[PDB]
UniProtKB/Swiss-Prot annotation:
Contains an acidic N-terminal A domain, a central N domain and a C-terminal GTPase G domain that can bind and hydrolyze GTP. Contains at least two lipid-binding sites. The first site contains the first 14 amino acids (helix 1) and the second binding site is an amphipathic alpha-helix located at the interface between the A- and the N-domain (helix 2). It comes from Escherichia coli (strain K12). GTP binds at D68, T69, A70, G71, R72. Involved in targeting and insertion of nascent membrane proteins into the cytoplasmic membrane. Acts as a receptor for the complex formed by the signal recognition particle (SRP) and the ribosome-nascent chain (RNC). Interaction with SRP-RNC leads to the transfer of the RNC complex to the Sec translocase for insertion into the membrane, the hydrolysis of GTP by both Ffh and FtsY, and the dissociation of the SRP-FtsY complex into the individual components. The gene is ftsY. This is Signal recognition particle receptor FtsY. It is found in: Cell inner membrane; Cytoplasm. Part of the signal recognition particle protein translocation system, which is composed of SRP and FtsY. SRP is a ribonucleoprotein composed of Ffh and a 4.5S RNA molecule. Binds to SecY.
Length: 90
RNA sequence: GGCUCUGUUGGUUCUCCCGCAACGCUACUCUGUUUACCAGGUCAGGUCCGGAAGGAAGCAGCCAAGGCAGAUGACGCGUGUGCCGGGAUGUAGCUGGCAGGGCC
């Protein structure tokens, strides 16, 4: 809504396929803002979803795209490598 | 100014197979101690046979070994990691691009 206020078009992307009902939550937040939200399912690859979200945003000429991520502790290296994979794909 | 679904293509999930790299799981054995005579070995002391030479049954101690524990390698069972790994397969499910219609 903050980015919806000055007239910038906003689209949301769900990057958490791990936690339960995160997709549905961001879909609720997306419905409250009356803006399209791109997500697939729980368990899906996050980097792929975010990638497709950016591609779609480029095709739909979306001004601002916000990409969510899964909650992760810093002491976990594999999740850090996953996030690095997300960035690398982006 | 947005959206949906077809044509084509890129991913992803599930089922099956496999490679590399990156994180995590039992039963046995090594040490800690334990088990009087009635599994075994060495068997002190003592005792049995003998003039002598020497053998003998065998307690304790010790070592296996049998109970109970502290953890060591391979078998057995798993995976929200990376190479968007390589493949098989869906009449599948989800997502994106493009050629676009049409709906507003
Ligand atoms: F949405 Al969360 F940990 F609760 F990423």
């Amino acid at each position: 809504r903050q980015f919806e206020q000055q007239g910038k078009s906003v689209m949301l992307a769900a990057g958490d396929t791990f936690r339960a009902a995160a997709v549905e939550q961001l879909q609720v937040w997306g419905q409250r803002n009356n803006i399209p939200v791109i997500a697939q399912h729980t368990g899906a690859d996050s980097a792929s979803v975010i990638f497709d979200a950016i591609q779609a945003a480029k095709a739909r000429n979306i001004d601002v795209l916000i990409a969510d991520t899964a909650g992760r502790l810093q002491n976990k290296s594999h999740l850090m490598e996953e996030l690095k994979k997300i960035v690398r794909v982006m």
